[PDB]
Amino acid sequence: DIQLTQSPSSLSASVGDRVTITCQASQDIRNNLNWYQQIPGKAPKLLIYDASNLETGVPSRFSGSASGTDFTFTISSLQPEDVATYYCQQYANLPPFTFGPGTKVDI
Amino acid sequence: PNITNLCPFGEVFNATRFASVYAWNRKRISNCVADYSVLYNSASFSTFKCYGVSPTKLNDLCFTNVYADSFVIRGDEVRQIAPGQTGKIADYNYKLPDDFTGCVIAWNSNNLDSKVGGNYNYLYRLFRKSNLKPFERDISTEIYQAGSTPCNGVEGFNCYFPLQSYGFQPTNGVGYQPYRVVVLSFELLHAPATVCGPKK
Amino acid sequence: EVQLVQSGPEVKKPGTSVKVSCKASGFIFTNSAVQWVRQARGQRLEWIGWIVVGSGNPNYAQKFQERVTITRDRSTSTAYMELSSLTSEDTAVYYCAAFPYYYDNSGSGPWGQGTLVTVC
Ligand SMILES: *[C@@H]1O[C@H](CO)[C@@H](O[C@@H]2O[C@H](CO)[C@@H](O)[C@H](O)[C@H]2NC(C)=O)[C@H](O)[C@H]1NC(C)=O
Structure with missing residues (x-):
């Protein structure tokens, strides 16, 4: 079994700040870790896959970084309109893809 | 004759x-x-x-x-x-x-x-540890070992089922x-x- | 072009199984993998099911085993989902994901519109 945790759990900022979401897993997944978006009223979609490897249709302000088992999701151009909830998603060679507690970023 | x-x-x-x-x-x-x-x-x-x-x-x-x-x-x-x-x-x-x-x-x-x-009955292999010698069968339903993490039997992102279907139409x-x-x-x-x- | 949709059954019968169908298009289907997750009111998200299109091993988490079943479906590109022993807190959005490049160590594939499987 694998487990992880997302520490921020809430943000309060308006503009400019390189807002970061730091989550840490029980196992040091090589690179098979991604992140998911969820609008308060729509279905979740993909922002970054394979530890910040961007995907077709991503915006510019979305990015990420890695440090050992710790994993950061960065917005260097935080704006008042990109308000939603985030999740960091894990999967490594085993079926249980347990989910993090997420985070509702707010102004 | x-x-x-x-x-x-x-x-x-x-x-x-x-x-x-x-x-x-x-x-x-x-x-x-x-x-x-x-x-x-x-x-x-x-x-x-x-x-x-x-x-x-x-x-x-x-x-x-x-x-x-x-x-x-x-x-x-x-x-x-x-x-x-x-x-x-x-x-x-x-x-x-x-x-x-x-x-x-x-x-x-x-x-x-x-x-x-579509008759998706026929199957072909997709992975193997190494190449194949001439004229020998490869009947085996054991998950191929990708990366280095062991495969105990549960399908995974480095534990691939060797076979897959053509999917004819x-x-x-x-x-x-x-x-x-x-x-x-x-x-x-x-x-x-x-x-x-x-x-x- | 790559996307997927789902059906919208709401309540089959309390204490009895329900049927959820997901269809997808835009990408080759008999190379990828599909999976099912639960979203309950309160923004809590958990994983439930996962099946590869290749051979088929309905592997689930320890919690929800012997209580769910996902069937391979090559009609055009589909999957069906069922789960028995409906309880008072099975009401949720059942979300579909699909990893197109399963054979690559990458994640992709949009998500369906969600099925509001409630109980009454
Ligand atoms: C295999 O099946 C084919 C199907 O036609 C056979 O072809 C026929 O063979 C007979 C016997 O020689 C001929 O009288 C017909 O004119 C052939 N028809 C056609 C369309 O070719 C064939 O003979 C069978 N046996 C083999 C190929 O060894």
Whole structure:
């Protein structure tokens, strides 16, 4: 079994700040870790896959970084309109893809 | 001379069910007279290639053993059944030696093997630890070990099921269509030859 | 072109199984993998099911085993989902994901519109 945790759990900022979401897993997944978006009223979609490897249709302000088992999701151009909830998603060679507690970023 | 037992070539071309590529049959045709002229003299065969012998001369030089094998494979890689050629199915599921000696025959069978909804019965391998030696089966349903994490049996992103399906549809492109392929390999073991030509 | 949609059954019968169908298009289907997750009111998200299109091993988490089933479906590109022993807190959005490049160590594939499987 694998487990992880997302520490921020809430943000309060308006503009400019390189807002970061730091989550840490029980196992040091090589690179098979991604992140998911969820609008308060729509279905979740993909922002970054394979530890910040961007995907077709991503915006510019979305990015990420890695440090050992710790994993950061960065917005260097935080704006008042990109308000939603985030999740960091894990999967490594085993079926249980347990989910993090997420985070509702707010102004 | 007259005539005697004729080889049951029909029972290897005109059968009803063909084994998937990963586990092919091996009929030990022996002690029979094979008339390859009727095989060659026909337009129903799309690809008719041979190596080590010209297709219009093999009707003599009685052989020792003839091995007939069958596959159903996607048309657009039939060529890579030839010796040496690399690819995906050839380098994992069936690879002929560079000194191969035999004939490769292939014909389209869109009217039989395909289905209205698509006959996804035939399967082919996708992964392996290393390449494959000539002329050996690979029947094994053990998950292939990718990366380095052990695979205890649970399918995973580095624990891949070796096989997957063609997914045939009788409306796809010509390349995607099925093709029935028969490989007729010849071997000359030091022993009385037992498969001669029609007139002899 | 690559996307997927789902059906919208709401309540089959309390204490009895329900049927959820997902269809997808735009990418080759008999190479990829599909999976099912639960979203309950309160923004809590958990994983439930996962099946590869290749061979088929309905592997699930320890919690929800012997209580769910996902069936391979090559109609055009589909999957069906069922789960028995409906309880008072099975009401949720059942979300579909699909990893197109399963054979690559990558994640992709949009998500369906969600099925509001409630109980009554
Ligand atoms: C395999 O089946 C084909 C299907 O037609 C057979 O082809 C016929 O063979 C008979 C006997 O020689 C001929 O009279 C017919 O004219 C052939 N028809 C066609 C359309 O070719 C074939 O003979 C069978 N046996 C083999 C190929 O060994």
